Design an enzyme around this catalytic site. Structure first.
Site, PDB file in Angstrom:
ATOM      1  N   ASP A  86      -6.897   5.933  12.357  1.00 18.51           N
ATOM      2  CA  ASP A  86      -6.305   6.854  13.376  1.00 18.51           C
ATOM      3  C   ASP A  86      -4.911   6.645  13.940  1.00 18.51           C
ATOM      4  O   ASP A  86      -4.447   7.616  14.403  1.00 18.51           O
ATOM      5  CB  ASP A  86      -7.555   6.589  14.863  1.00 18.51           C
ATOM      6  CG  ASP A  86      -8.854   6.899  14.540  1.00 18.51           C
ATOM      7  OD1 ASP A  86      -9.312   7.438  13.150  1.00 18.51           O
ATOM      8  OD2 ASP A  86      -9.629   7.074  15.344  1.00 18.51           O
ATOM      9  N   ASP A 102      -8.072   5.526  -0.050  1.00 18.33           N
ATOM     10  CA  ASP A 102      -6.644   5.659  -0.605  1.00 18.33           C
ATOM     11  C   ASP A 102      -6.674   5.200  -1.835  1.00 18.33           C
ATOM     12  O   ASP A 102      -5.700   4.428  -2.257  1.00 18.33           O
ATOM     13  CB  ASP A 102      -5.753   4.799   0.412  1.00 18.33           C
ATOM     14  CG  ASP A 102      -4.384   5.107   0.202  1.00 18.33           C
ATOM     15  OD1 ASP A 102      -4.261   6.324  -0.250  1.00 18.33           O
ATOM     16  OD2 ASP A 102      -3.514   4.544   0.724  1.00 18.33           O
TER      17      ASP A 102
HETATM   18  N1  LIG Z   1      -1.346  -8.421  -3.067  1.00 17.32           N
HETATM   19  C1  LIG Z   1      -0.480  -7.690  -3.927  1.00 17.32           C
HETATM   20  N2  LIG Z   1       0.106  -8.541  -4.797  1.00 17.32           N
HETATM   21  C2  LIG Z   1       1.314  -8.034  -5.394  1.00 17.32           C
HETATM   22  N3  LIG Z   1       1.980  -6.693  -5.420  1.00 17.32           N
HETATM   23  C3  LIG Z   1       1.451  -6.039  -4.281  1.00 17.32           C
HETATM   24  C4  LIG Z   1       0.215  -6.381  -3.297  1.00 17.32           C
HETATM   25  N4  LIG Z   1      -0.023  -5.479  -2.687  1.00 17.32           N
HETATM   26  C5  LIG Z   1       0.834  -4.516  -2.859  1.00 17.32           C
HETATM   27  N5  LIG Z   1       1.607  -4.731  -3.696  1.00 17.32           N
HETATM   28  C6  LIG Z   1       2.803  -4.030  -4.241  1.00 17.32           C
HETATM   29  O1  LIG Z   1       3.449  -3.335  -3.239  1.00 17.32           O
HETATM   30  C7  LIG Z   1       3.821  -2.146  -3.508  1.00 17.32           C
HETATM   31  C8  LIG Z   1       3.879  -1.266  -2.172  1.00 17.32           C
HETATM   32  O2  LIG Z   1       2.696  -1.258  -1.527  1.00 17.32           O
HETATM   33  P1  LIG Z   1       2.250  -0.138  -0.439  1.00 17.32           P
HETATM   34  O3  LIG Z   1       3.223  -0.379   0.862  1.00 17.32           O
HETATM   35  O4  LIG Z   1       0.992  -0.454  -0.146  1.00 17.32           O
HETATM   36  O5  LIG Z   1       2.570   0.914  -0.892  1.00 17.32           O
HETATM   37  P2  LIG Z   1       1.793   2.240  -1.564  1.00 17.32           P
HETATM   38  O6  LIG Z   1       0.425   1.724  -2.085  1.00 17.32           O
HETATM   39  O7  LIG Z   1       2.316   3.012  -2.398  1.00 17.32           O
HETATM   40  N6  LIG Z   1       1.074   2.932  -0.268  1.00 17.32           N
HETATM   41  P3  LIG Z   1      -0.353   2.706   0.833  1.00 17.32           P
HETATM   42  O8  LIG Z   1      -1.275   2.009   0.147  1.00 17.32           O
HETATM   43  O9  LIG Z   1      -0.933   4.307   0.875  1.00 17.32           O
HETATM   44  O10 LIG Z   1       0.128   2.274   2.322  1.00 17.32           O
HETATM   45  C9  LIG Z   1       2.561  -1.699  -4.198  1.00 17.32           C
HETATM   46  O11 LIG Z   1       2.822  -0.566  -5.116  1.00 17.32           O
HETATM   47  C10 LIG Z   1       2.250  -2.895  -5.125  1.00 17.32           C
HETATM   48  O12 LIG Z   1       2.947  -2.681  -6.413  1.00 17.32           O
END
Ligand SMILES: Nc1ncnc2c1ncn2[C@@H]1O[C@H](COP(=O)(O)OP(=O)(O)NP(=O)(O)O)[C@@H](O)[C@H]1O
Ligand SMILES: O=C(c1cccnc1)c1cc2ccccc2[nH]1
Ligand SMILES: [Mg+2]
Length: 302
Positions: free
Chosen positions: A185, A158
Site C-alpha cells: 500500500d 512480484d
Molecule cells: N539475497 C540476495 N542475495 C544476492 N543478491 C541479491 C539478493 N537480493 C537481491 N539481490 C540482487 O539485488 C538486485 C536488485 O534487487 P531489487 O532492488 O529487489 O531489484 P528488482 O528485483 O529488480 N525489483 P523489485 O523486487 O520489484 O523491488 C537483484 O536483481 C538481485 O540480483
C-alpha cells in the site's frame, strides 16, 4: 537447536542446508544500522537498493535491501511488524531472512546472501538459460509459491527473473514476495503483471503463474518476449495473444507448460496443483542436472 522441521518433506541435503542457515541465524540478534559495513552493491530496483554487507557483531555476510520510506511512524512500524512473519518463512525455495528494521528514512530487509545473484543477472552472462535448468527453476518456483500459499496464506505478487535467487550450492530461492500488505500500500520497459492484474482484477496465485510463465519464456529465449512504449507494451499483454516459445528448439512438454501458464483467462490458466503434475515438471524432477556446476561455469564462481 530444537528444530520443528517435520511439516516440510525435505531431502537430507535440504534438511542439512536449512539447519545450517537457522544455526547461523542464532548468532544474530537485534539489527542496528551501526552494526553494518557496506562491502559492495549487489544491485538496485524501483523500490530499493541491495548491498552486500558485513554484519559486524556476528561476522555474517548478508544482503541488505534498503527501501526508502519516510512516512508516518505508526504506519512504518506496522510495516516492520508485518515483516517479522519472514522469521517463520523457512523453506529451501525461499531466501533466508535475518531481520528487518527502520533507520533514517529507510526500511532494511536483511537476508541470506545468494552468491549466484538473480536469474536476470545470470541471463545476461548465459545469453539463454537451458531448458533443463529452467525445469529446476520451474520446480523451485512452484514449490516456493506453494509453501507461501499453503503455510503463510501469502501470494508472491512480484514473480520475475530478478526475484529468483541462485547460489554456488545450486539452490534456487524466491525473494521480494508480498509479505507486508502495508508495504505494498505505501509503495516500466518490462512488465510481468498478468492481463487481469493490469486491468485491476483482485490478486490471485493465477497472476503469479502468469508472471512465472513469462519469466520462463524470457529466460529460455534470452529476451523480454513482448517486442517499446509503456501503453504499447501493456496493450499488447492485455489485447494480443500471449507469447509462445519458438518451435524446433524446445520440447513439446515445455511449450505446453508455458502455454498453460500464459492462458489469458485466469480460470482456464493452470493452477499450482496442475502444474506440479504436468509432464514438464515430472520429466524435470527425474533429471540429474548439475545446476550448481552449470551456474559456477557460466558466471565464474567456486
Ligand atoms: N539475497 C540476495 N542475495 C544476492 N543478491 C541479491 C539478493 N537480493 C537481491 N539481490 C540482487 O539485488 C538486485 C536488485 O534487487 P531489487 O532492488 O529487489 O531489484 P528488482 O528485483 O529488480 N525489483 P523489485 O523486487 O520489484 O523491488 C537483484 O536483481 C538481485 O540480483
Ligand atoms: O519488498 C518486499 C515486500 C514487498 C511487498 C510486501 N512485503 C514485502 C520484500 C523484500 C523481501 C526480501 C526477502 C523476502 C521477502 C521480501 N519481501
Ligand atoms: Mg527484487
Amino acid at each position: 537447536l530444537y528444530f520443528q522441521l517435520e511439516e516440510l518433506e525435505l531431502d537430507e541435503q535440504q534438511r542439512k542446508r536449512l539447519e545450517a542457515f537457522l544455526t547461523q541465524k542464532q548468532k544474530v540478534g537485534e539489527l542496528k544500522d551501526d552494526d553494518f559495513e557496506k562491502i559492495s552493491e549487489l544491485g538496485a530496483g524501483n523500490g530499493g537498493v541491495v548491498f552486500k554487507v558485513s554484519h559486524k557483531p556476528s561476522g555474517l555476510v548478508m544482503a541488505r535491501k534498503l527501501i526508502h520510506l519516510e512516512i508516518k511512524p505508526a504506519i512504518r512500524n506496522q510495516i516492520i511488524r508485518e515483516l517479522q512473519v519472514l522469521h517463520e518463512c523457512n523453506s529451501p525455495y525461499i531466501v533466508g531472512f535475518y531481520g528487518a528494521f527502520y533507520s533514517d528514512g529507510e526500511i532494511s530487509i536483511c537476508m541470506e546472501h545468494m552468491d549466484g545473484g538473480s536469474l536476470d543477472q545470470v541471463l545476461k552472462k548465459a545469453g539463454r538459460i537451458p531448458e533443463q535448468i529452467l525445469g529446476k527453476v520451474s520446480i523451485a518456483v512452484i514449490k516456493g509459491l506453494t509453501y507461501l500459499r499453503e503455510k503463510h496464506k501469502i501470494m508472491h505478487r512480484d514473480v520475475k527473473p530478478s526475484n529468483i535467487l541462485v547460489n554456488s550450492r545450486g539452490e534456487i530461492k524466491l525473494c521480494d514476495f508480498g509479505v507486508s500488505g502495508q508495504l505494498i500500500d505505501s509503495m516500466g520497459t518490462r512488465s510481468y503483471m498478468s492481463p487481469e492484474r493490469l486491468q485491476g482484477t483482485h490478486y490471485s496465485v493465477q497472476s503469479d503463474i502468469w508472471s512465472m510463465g513469462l519469466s520462463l519464456v524470457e529466460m529460455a529465449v534470452g529476451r523480454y518476449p513482448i517486442g517499446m512504449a509503456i501503453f504499447e507494451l501493456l496493450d499488447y499483454i492485455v489485447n494480443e495473444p500471449p507469447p509462445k516459445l519458438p518451435s524446433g528448439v524446445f520440447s513439446l512438454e515445455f511449450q505446453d507448460f508455458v502455454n498453460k501458464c500464459l492462458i489469458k483467462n485466469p480460470a482456464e490458466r493452470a493452477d499450482l496443483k496442475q502444474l506440479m503434475v504436468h509432464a514438464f515438471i515430472k520429466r524435470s524432477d527425474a533429471e540429474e542436472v548439475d545446476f550448481a556446476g552449470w551456474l559456477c561455469s557460466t558466471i565464474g564462481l567456486n
